[PDB]
Swiss-Prot record, chains A, C:
(E)-cinnamate binds at N184, Q272, R278, N308, K380, E408, N411. This is Phenylalanine aminomutase (L-beta-phenylalanine forming). GO terms for cellular component: cytoplasm. Changing Y275A: Abolishes the formation of the MIO cofactor and thereby abolishes enzyme activity. CDD domains: PAL-HAL (cd00332). It comes from Taxus chinensis. It is found in: Cytoplasm. The lineage of its organism: Eukaryota, Viridiplantae, Streptophyta, Embryophyta, Tracheophyta. It catalyses: L-phenylalanine = L-beta-phenylalanine; L-phenylalanine = (E)-cinnamate + NH4(+). GO terms for molecular function: intramolecular aminotransferase activity; phenylalanine ammonia-lyase activity. InterPro entries: Aromatic_Lyase, Fumarase/histidase_N, L-Aspartase-like, Phe/His_NH3-lyase_AS, Phe_NH3-lyase, Phe_NH3-lyase_shielding_dom_sf, Taxol_Phe_23mut.
């Protein structure tokens, strides 16, 4: 299962300490992401590929180089490629050299290892590559000590020769082929593509998992994930996503509550869920497969000699080809961007269902707690932003590779545009992170609303029950009124529970007429009138008390039951509420939606979200 | 190799007689394309393997029913408009795919309805279906359902067009009275998106292989360097599509007589490396090969699925509510294939462009114009213009459809695949790709003729120069100089007027005549003999060049691309394009296009690839 | 003419000191751009519209507000809308209020004037608007003193209530409608659209003008701009662009040189220019019209009551409509982005012709000076970047408005996405600036190469002429050899002028054989052999001397003629060479292409480019 593969990626990202660069051991996208984001991760170039590097180097030894670099130092600082992308590119260039096909000196390779481990990188302009001569020229420029090339060292910026000075290096004098060997690669496109693919895997898994949380809060039917449905339409991504969702929803206490819900007023409630949940495995299927396949493609590029000419020293020839052509990466970046847009549309559709009372099976509009809805518009602002996020995301998913210009005196009459496409896919993922942050925040709001819903219904039942006993109502009467208290969605009358025009009192009045018809008439009416009168003394205060207690909440014996404790999604709710310090959104909570969603976004952006994710998936 | 897989696909398309429909034997895109396109291919629905579960399922549904609704669903969905139609090929494919879905025994449909679909398929009866209305395929599948229930508004083709109940009469059927779940089962599938996607994928595989193969023919005519396909280059950047396309190209170009001429060309006096359109072809092809092969597996998975809802698990006495009608696997992969097809078109455009430009074609004339009189021969300029038009529309088509999901059907379908719309656009892209391939192949046959004429003409110039050098009593020094010029100067740069003193032959000869004067410095008689040489050259040279060209109007005989050249020239009855060939470019390219469209191109393709 | 209108925009941008905000005087995109970019520009709210504001305010006076703001403070800091865009939005919101339709208090309007003039603005998240509730909530948040809202003051960041403190204001307590009045506008989309349109006008005019410079350096035929061609196909933008180009090219000394060029070897040279020049007015036509029309549309929005409800106090009603809908701006932002892409394609095509010897009519490949081309690849890096720039630009020009989602509980089932589209058009313009910077830099390189070309041909002629006299060659002989010296493109043999295999000696040898044939034979040959021998003693040194002098260059009597001094494009060449301190690019010039293009880019980005532009167009 891809779920296991992604879990393995997250684990490698967390666990790696040294990246072995040796011409045989594959570098994965997790390794690339770790080097870029975790500064304690070091490069280990192993001399035991030095033999093949030096043979190729020697073979080639059998002004022109600096002129190539000068020509290519032609970008403009408008914006730059981040240091994370630049260090990634440095790693990938070094790796390309390990296969003994480039002819660069071992000493240059050692210098790259040193600069990487000392956190030295050139500042590189964002644009200029059709895929990565111009950006790679800035790395070549640092190595040869060009004064115009500025280098960061940690977070301190100096001219290139001073940067080499601080790590005990002196400017290289380039030998035959070395200039070309340094600039003639796919390092930048593939670097950005590597962290893109790492993020795509993590966020894909997060979205899949959160489909389960959506099911729990929306009162879905977990049947959509039944293995027979998917065995019979066996797209690998469809079988695997459904398999995860089936396990996530097995023995869920929210699914038990969902079953109870649909047994009440069965005829009046939807027989199937809407597509955003029911069709999630079918939808996820291509998206899973695209992201997994693109991960294999990008990693093949990471672990390639992307250079020209290719030296076959064993057979005494230089081979003229085009391993500098970033097309594998570029086409796959276009596909993944379309898949990310598809994940965004899934999230948007789910979020939309959640905000609308007609589609949320009992939840309040905008997930507004109220009770006073005139001064609580709940998550409306987040709902508007989700439309803005999806709209821009769908726009971004148009292809880049369809815009190939005939370039460089018509020499490059096909060119990959891989870096440009990878940059766009990264931008799409930024928006997907925003959409996931909002979706999870809304679902935690929904958890609270469902838990509160149950406690409020219990209060109404207790009030109806005890008042019926007090007023001396018949069994037939008590049975009917308690059914109304159980069946009427509490959020439809929470604003003013005793309002005779709102659904609770409307339901009670229907049942009161029905009990009169079914059955001392004059005394019955008097007792029903006293029931109604006492209901408006007691009910609202008791509903208020239970809600205030919930809002003000370590649980004790007075606190409302919290079904979340029995749910596999506990790690997510607890992470967002306890660890990030948030609470039910309402007019009484000072913090803005920005403040709450910002905390969730930050945790997704910096990888802290993987902790609750890994907790949730334990035992799968 | 994917190469062997595609060859397997072509062979299946050609050789299949009966499509077995049995619930276990996979139906491939070649099978779907063969049913659609070849009318001798019949459906064989096999009771022995699947009727038993079909029957148990439909009985289960009846049991639950016992413990007009269907017609009203069909009526509501007869909601298309004839503006344009889904073609009979797509509709018959849809009927096959719906029938196949039913074999898994999850649908609750009666076996007798399945027999009717087999009967209609084998008698060439299909409803007329509006093009548009599906978000993926209720509306278009309703027309199949409307035929089966004899809706008079549904028009049916037979082979002749009549209303549905009359169409049923002619195959000995009566209108069905739908049982519980049958109305839904008939309309609740991915059959039309997947049908169009199936022929799309068959065509994509064939056209991919054709493009890869023609990259080798391009190398031969453009004077490329075949080392770009060396296995070590691709071993060290091991994308499977890159390794496999290069493997084919190395084999195609090994022992090429054109590559021999190429090597000789770069030995006199010129680019050190080929431009990208050839040198970078394996790298370019890599993701395109991989996208088309992967999308073929996805489409075939859909063909062989129970795309329906609810899914009946009769064995455990329950109906499962899901969304197997969602065509997202197909829709997304149609978006990717369209981008890959645009990538194929861009490769062809780049190659064709190089071929038309004298600066980039290594000796060929601009527009591949034979002339000699270029003022009345613009050669293939019209085709060159069209290729830009083709690529431009193609790049536009490759924008995604799946990014345009609306919240549909009372917001119930808040995600939908749009797979049929996407398949239709990929089909349109492939139409354009066929046009581009036909033009490219036509141009390369022209280029073969021009290369073979070139070799013969250079020999005539050498023969003329040599013999006149003897006749005029020129020194050996002089003779060797003049002969080097006759070999070095690209003949197409002076063919228009060989003795024009401002064109490159005489310019080179005049240079050499001065060098010979300096080197040998009886001077007056030497000058007299050089003047007489120039005089006799303008009496004789053009005449003998004309004679050899008129005779023309060996090298390809040793090329792996012989089958293609012979197909286009001999079998399709064409010739080198010129002012003396009455047939328009349209007439020649139409023949090539027609052979691509109807699959006749696969014969020289398979010949070419024999023993690979 | 649109040329006059754009000149008027640039002049207003430069000249404005106070922006009158009074409900009658139009605010133009130049005023909006000036406020944003020039801090000495102040807002002047005139009390003599205060009467209508207060009447509307009073009419409305006949908790709910802060709850709206709280709900909308829902963006995430991922990136932000720049202070320039935020201050622009503040101006546009203030302007909307002046029409007396909003019901906001005059005091709130005074507060906005004060914050603008004191350089106070909230930090605003980039995304969230479908067009501008969420971003406008940050301005509303500053005004009401929300602690979570951070404000910049100059370049110093503090919480909102402290920001109000420093400008002598206290948090507002919002009255009826004021919350909605503040957030219910198109201010952000229209702000970004205003500076987009200002830049689009300036850069359009710059591109049109530079088509004339391209003609001069490429040896074009100015006939393409003849007024009859355009009178007969009378698209307004076509007539007006051709009219500019005709005037720019009238009495040009480069066009005189071009005429001489095509009189030599007439038969062998193209009879017409390629489309990048010849078709420029036809191409520019729609682009001109789109940018001008979109300027009118955006300015109408700037000068509108974009708010709801609209108060008709005169007739005692509040009118319910949708003036908050940014569709006019959004659709036009899509069109302008397509037009900007079209300008980019024009530049790319021109740049491509310039770099290729087969298309540049005598100029060297990559505009490489050499003479040693093995170590001078000239502008190749810039040529590659231009392909990268165009490719991304064409991708950006896909539409945003085609991605309308049904938003906000399906209430906003159509929405403009105007801010998103405007942001994309701004990004497209960033790339257009990069492409213009490169194009102008290449054309200055080309100016130098043409001036040098003329001086080198003069040297060859002088050497041939005097050596012919020295060696005692016949008139027939001297006449022929001087024709060769005049006709052979010097850049085809500059690498090694006496190389017998290169075009100069090839031409001389052809003519020597021709003179022998046309005409003491043995003495003639001896003199021709001595000519050739002396040519290889003298020629290269004299060509070198003239070139070195040019490179090392206030002109004196030894210096080569500089035709640029007589050209209307002098202001551009002089700006780039003298004012920005650059020179002919070559292996002997230390500065990288980055360094040279960076200077030009900076001048375009900050508006300094308008000075040479206005000089060039003086008298049109």
């Amino acid at each position: 299962s891809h779920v296991k593969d992604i879990l393995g990626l997250i684990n490698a990202f967390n666990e790696v300490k040294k990246i072995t660069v040796d011409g045989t051991t594959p570098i994965t996208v997790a390794h690339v992401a770790a080097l870029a984001r975790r500064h304690d991760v070091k490069v280990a170039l192993e001399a035991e590929c030095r033999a093949r590097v030096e043979t190729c180097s020697s073979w080639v030894q059998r002004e022109l180089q600096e002129s190539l670099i000068r020509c290519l130092l032609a970008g403009v600082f408008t914006d730059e490629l981040p240091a994370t992308a630049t260090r990634s590119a440095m790693l990938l260039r070094l790796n390309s050299f390990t296969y003994g096909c480039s002819g660069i000196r071992w000493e240059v390779m050692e210098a790259l290892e040193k600069l990487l481990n000392s956190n030295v990188s050139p500042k590189v302009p964002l644009r200029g590559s059709v895929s990565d001569l111009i950006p790679l020229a800035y790395i070549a420029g640092l190595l040869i000590g060009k004064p115009s090339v500025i280098a960061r060292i940690g977070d301190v910026e100096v001219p290139a020769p001073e940067a080499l000075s601080r790590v005990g290096l002196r400017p290289f004098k380039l030998q035959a082929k070395e200039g070309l060997a340094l600039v003639n690669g796919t390092s930048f496109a593939t670097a950005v593509a590597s962290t893109v693919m790492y993020d795509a895997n993590v966020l894909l898994l997060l979205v899949e998992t959160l489909c389960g949380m959506f099911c729990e809060v929306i009162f879905g039917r977990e049947e959509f994930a039944h293995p027979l449905i998917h065995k019979v339409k066996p797209h690998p991504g469809q079988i695997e996503s459904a398999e995860l969702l089936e396990w996530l929803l097995r023995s869920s206490p929210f699914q038990e509550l969902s079953r109870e819900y649909y047994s009440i007023d069965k005829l009046k409630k939807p027989k199937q869920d809407r597509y955003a949940l029911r069709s999630s495995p079918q939808w996820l299927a291509p998206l899973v497969q695209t992201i997994r396949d693109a991960t294999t493609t990008v990693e093949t590029e990471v672990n390639s000699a992307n250079d020209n000419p290719i030296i076959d020293h064993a057979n005494d020839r230089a081979l003229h080809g085009a391993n500098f052509q970033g097309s594998a990466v570029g086409f796959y970046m276009d596909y993944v961007r379309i898949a990310v847009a598809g994940l965004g549309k899934l999230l948007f559709a789910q979020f939309t269902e959640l905000m609308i009372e007609y589609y949320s099976n009992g939840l309040p509009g905008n997930l507004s707690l109220g009770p006073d809805l005139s001064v609580d518009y709940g998550l409306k602002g987040l709902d508007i932003a989700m439309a803005a996020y999806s709209s821009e995301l769908q726009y971004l998913a148009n292809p880049v590779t369809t815009h190939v210009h005939s370039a460089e005196q018509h020499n490059q009459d096909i060119n990959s545009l891989a870096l440009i496409s990878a940059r766009k896919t990264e931008e799409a993922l930024d928006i997907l992170k925003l959409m996931i942050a909002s979706h999870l925040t809304a679902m935690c709001q929904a958890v609270d609303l469902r838990q509160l819903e149950e406690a409020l219904v219990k209060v109404v039942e207790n009030v109806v029950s005890t008042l019926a006993d007090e007023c001396g109502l018949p069994n037939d009467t008590k049975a009917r009124l308690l059914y109304v208290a159980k069946a009427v969605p509490v959020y439809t009358y929470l604003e003013s529970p005793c309002d005779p025009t709102l659904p609770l009192l409307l339901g009670l009045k229907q049942s009161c007429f029905d009990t009169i018809l079914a059955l001392e008439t004059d005394t019955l009416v008097d007792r029903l009138a006293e029931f109604e009168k006492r209901l408006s003394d007691r009910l609202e205060n008791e509903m208020t008390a239970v809600r205030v207690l919930y809002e003000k909440k370590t649980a004790d014996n007075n606190d409302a039951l919290v079904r979340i404790q029995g749910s596999k999604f506990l790690p997510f709710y607890r992470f967002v509420r306890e660890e990030l310090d948030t609470g039910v959104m309402s007019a009484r909570r000072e913090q803005t939606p920005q403040e709450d969603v910002q905390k969730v976004f930050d945790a997704i952006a910096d990888g802290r979200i993987t902790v609750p994710l890994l907790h949730c998936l334990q035992g799968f």
